[PDB]
Amino acid sequence: GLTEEQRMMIRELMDAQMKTFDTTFSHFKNFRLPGVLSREEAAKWSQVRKDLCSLKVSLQLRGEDGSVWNYKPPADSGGKEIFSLLPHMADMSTYMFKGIISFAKVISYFRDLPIEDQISLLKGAAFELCQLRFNTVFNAETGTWECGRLSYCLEDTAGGFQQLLLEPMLKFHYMLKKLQLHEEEYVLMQAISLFSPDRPGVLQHRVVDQLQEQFAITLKSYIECNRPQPAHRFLFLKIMAMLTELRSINAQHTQRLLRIQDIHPFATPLMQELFGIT
Amino acid sequence: GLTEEQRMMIRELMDAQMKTFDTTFSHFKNFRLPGVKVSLQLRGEDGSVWNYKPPSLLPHMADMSTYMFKGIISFAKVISYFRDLPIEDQISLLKGAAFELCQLRFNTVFNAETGTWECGRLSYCLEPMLKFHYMLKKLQLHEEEYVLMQAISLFSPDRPGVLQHRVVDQLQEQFAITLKSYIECNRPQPAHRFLFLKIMAMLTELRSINAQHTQRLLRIQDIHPFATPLMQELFGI
Amino acid sequence: SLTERHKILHRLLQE
Amino acid sequence: ERHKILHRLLQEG
Ligand SMILES: Cc1sc2c(c1C)C(c1ccc(Cl)cc1)=N[C@@H](CC(=O)OC(C)(C)C)c1[nH]nc(C)[n+]1-2
Ligand SMILES: Cc1sc2c(c1C)C(c1ccc(Cl)cc1)=N[C@@H](CC(=O)OC(C)(C)C)c1[nH]nc(C)[n+]1-2
């Protein structure tokens, strides 16, 4: 069984999640939407095109009457149009980041850390925790993140499923969903991600490293206690490998975000702080 | 192979169509939108598409119809034979033919393979009205035939309130004779057999569809208000 | 007669 | 001051 120190750890993480994750997105109310009836510089525009072509999503808005507005983005012509979704996604990301900051704030182990390490941990893990929360609303049968009345649908092409697996962020979401994790495993993953001692700017490397290990030990014990099936022999290491992949996707997304921001400013004030944009 | 009077008649009609039919809906603006069974697609210049799937659309359609009606009033005003009529007969003629000329203009953007009226920036995807549209489209009419059908409908002497019946009747006959001559001298392929008489029959069917729609809307407006001020005038509501 | 009941239509025809 | 919004969000209850 789990130790009571461990059962309480999970209880505090789960209460934090319940209080700070708007799973129905019912309080995401104000956001921008794409309009209705709307040398080195050129090399930078080229790379950003290849960044933005990596993830093609359509936006679905479902009304309370059952009607649906579907937005299909334009195909890459010669500029501007490739950015039509960026305001909306900035508002969506900023909304999610506020939720992650609120999650970290209610964790005892986080509040007790020096504030500049709190800031450093959040700047390094914000995208990762948002993606972990996004995985819980990912419908792998429809390739859709179901965000209440909003839905983000992967645009299906000629290659089908195997084409989507070419994008590391997409392969991440499919592979994690297949692990069929419980809410408790998800929230422990978020804690291990948040308390990464190796983020830039963390001074108390040893304290965070020790806390990260206690979350990892609690995750290992939870799996042993509630999933005794020999089918889950390596589940814990499989989760950890997903976290290693999330760090690589985090680095690539940061680099991509920065390039897009250079040629077309979109980041909200909170995003600017999280990503180091002046 | 037309007389100059007839060849001129078609020129004025075709120039009027070109100047008053916003085929792309490029100037349709400030319209109400569903949620803000017809499916609506709104296409931006960038190639982006907003699609509305139904479960509310009536306000939008009233705005779109009124826009089309404005184009049809503008069409009539730029035709010499219409402008020379007493204003009261101009009004009576436009009240009786507005729905018909809009449906004729909508038929020219109708795609019968998809059941979609493709109006540029707007598209409407899917009744005797539907039947009319599929049957008219099958005739593969030219712009010249459509615009003459619009004239024959516009200059209907039997419309309620028309006073100069004979003037309007003699004008209609001259349009109908010009249509007949156009087809004989410009369309010999056997698919277009009896085309003139077939068009004249479609116009009679459009007359009945117009009657049935007016009666429907005169009753619905009592319960659900949607008609724009101009629609209320045109349909006698 | 028709002119006063059709003020908008009359306006659009005149303009 | 580089993290004014983050500081405020962490301070609030
Ligand atoms: C404007 C912004 S802000 C942003 C993104 C964009 C585009 C992108 C993104 C960036 C680069 C490329 Cl090439 C593709 C997407 N991803 C989202 C994740 C998301 O909200 O999308 C899914 C819901 C998972 C589909 C995200 N997380 N954190 C941030 C800061 N962003
Ligand atoms: C609210 C309104 S106002 C209206 C309509 C609706 C719905 C309908 C209509 C009414 C009844 C059904 Cl059974 C179907 C459509 N049609 C339009 C024109 C239209 O949309 O044409 C195509 C369909 C594009 C050819 C039209 N013309 N004049 C009027 C008064 N209306």
Residue numbers in the entry:
A (entry chain A): 142 to 179, 193 to 432
B (entry chain B): 142 to 177, 210 to 228, 238 to 308, 321 to 431
C (entry chain D): 682 to 696
D (entry chain C): 685 to 697
Article passage:
Of the receptors known to regulate CYP3A4 transcription, PXR is the main ligand-dependent CYP3A4 regulator and is renowned for its highly promiscuous ligand binding pocket.
To investigate the binding mode of JQ1 to PXR LBD, we solved the PXR LBD-JQ1 co-crystal structure in the presence of coactivator SRC-1 peptide. Consistent with previously reported structures, the asymmetric unit contained two PXR LBD (chains A and B) and two SRC-1 peptides (chains C and D). In both PXR LBD chains, the thienotriazolodiazepine core and tert-butyl acetate group of JQ1 were clearly resolved, but weaker density was observed for the chlorophenyl appendage. Interestingly, α2 was present in chain A but was not resolved in chain B, indicating that the close proximity of the chlorophenyl to the region displaces or destabilizes α2. When residues within 5 Å of JQ1 in chain A were analyzed, we observed a void between α2 (S208 and L209) and α3 (L240, M243, and A244) that may allow the chlorophenyl and additional groups to freely move. Indeed, JQ1 clearly has at least two binding poses since two different modes were observed between the two PXR LBD chains. The flexibility observed in the PXR LBD-JQ1 co-crystal structure contrasts with the constrained binding poses in bromodomain-JQ1 structures, highlighting the structural features that allow PXR to bind diverse molecules.
